[PDB]
Amino acid sequence: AIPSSLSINWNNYATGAYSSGNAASDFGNAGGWNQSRSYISDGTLRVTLLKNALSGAGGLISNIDVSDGTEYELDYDVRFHSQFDWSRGGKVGFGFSIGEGNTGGDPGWDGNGGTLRMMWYQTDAGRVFFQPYIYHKDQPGQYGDTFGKSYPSSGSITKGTTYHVHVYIKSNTGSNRDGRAQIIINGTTVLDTAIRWTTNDAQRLIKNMTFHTFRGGSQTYWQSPVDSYIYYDNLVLRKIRLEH
């Protein structure tokens, strides 16, 4: 199935390992799942980030094919484990990908896609926050555009604390800046900007939901020396519209 809406709170699940088949059954599709890192812990989904690893090698990186549309939103809760090792940062939670879904060192400059994802991040100065991480047509750098935004705007986020995340995305048209990228955390606006995602209309649609939980970054210094855990809950996905 290619869902256009999803509602998953994992409350019908036993504490214990969450298999690929469970994920495919709930999400409809999940083509990267590593059941070794997905575990239902007390009615929530715990993802494992393994020590001494980056990317898929140590985390869980799945793209859920959703019904194509121009307007999408999702909601979920996320909590870092009690002794989570912040390290440098990484990707967290549920986002969206338009067109070719640009990520990696591949900027949206070719006008063929981007992504709306979210990261946690630690500064050399010791602050730790959430931050948008957007590839799009006009990102200033080769890697993810944060738009200079962080949550909280001052101070750090805390371990063992549940944060509700709302994400809203809207396709642009042609070469116009009529799209939208929005992140709302605990009802507070983190990012709410108009945006140009694509200049190729054949790639303008929101195509799938990203579920990325991994450290990095690309270099070995984004790694952590310990296993760490992140917990998600109460995922609500909704296709608001498809409009050509």
User: What residue ranges bind Ca ion (CB under 5 A)?
Assistant: 9-11, 43, 233
Query: By C-alpha distance, which of 57, 62, 56 is closest to 27?
Result: 62
Residue 10 Cβ vs Ca ion, minimum distance, rounded to whole Å:
5
Q: For residues 15 and 175, which CB has a smaller minimum distance to Ca ion in the complex?
A: 15
CA atoms of 139 and 216, how far apart (whole Å): 19
Residue 14 Cβ vs Ca ion, minimum distance, rounded to whole Å:
12
Q: Which residue has the tokens 């979920």?
A: 76
Q: For residues 9 and 20, which CB has a smaller minimum distance to Ca ion in the complex?
A: 9
Per the annotation, does 95 bind a ligand?
Answer: no
CB 18 within 8 A of CB 35: yes
Q: For residues 41 and 67, which CB has a smaller minimum distance to Ca ion in the complex?
A: 41
Query: Residue 106: CB partners within 8 Å, gap ≥ 6?
Result: 135
CA atoms of 108 and 106, how far apart (whole Å): 7
Q: Please report, for the chain, how many H helices and E strands are present, in that order.
A: 2, 14
CA atoms of 25 and 48, how far apart (whole Å): 20
Residue 72 Cβ vs Ca ion, minimum distance, rounded to whole Å:
22
Q: For residues 10 and 168, which CB has a smaller minimum distance to Ca ion in the complex?
A: 10
Bond prior to 58 in cis (omega within 30° of 0): no
Per the annotation, does 34 bind a ligand?
Answer: no
Question: Tokens at residue 101, please?
Answer: 């879904």
Residue 25 Cβ vs Ca ion, minimum distance, rounded to whole Å:
16
CA atoms of 144 and 115, how far apart (whole Å): 9
CA atoms of 13 and 187, how far apart (whole Å): 28
CA atoms of 55 and 49, how far apart (whole Å): 9
Residue 233 Cβ vs Ca ion, minimum distance, rounded to whole Å:
4
Per the annotation, does 11 bind a ligand?
Answer: yes
Q: For residues 9 and 193, which CB has a smaller minimum distance to Ca ion in the complex?
A: 9
Per the annotation, does 43 bind a ligand?
Answer: yes
Residue 156 Cβ vs Ca ion, minimum distance, rounded to whole Å:
26
Q: For residues 47 and 191, which CB has a smaller minimum distance to Ca ion in the complex?
A: 47
Annotated binding site for Ca(2+): 9, 11, 43, 233
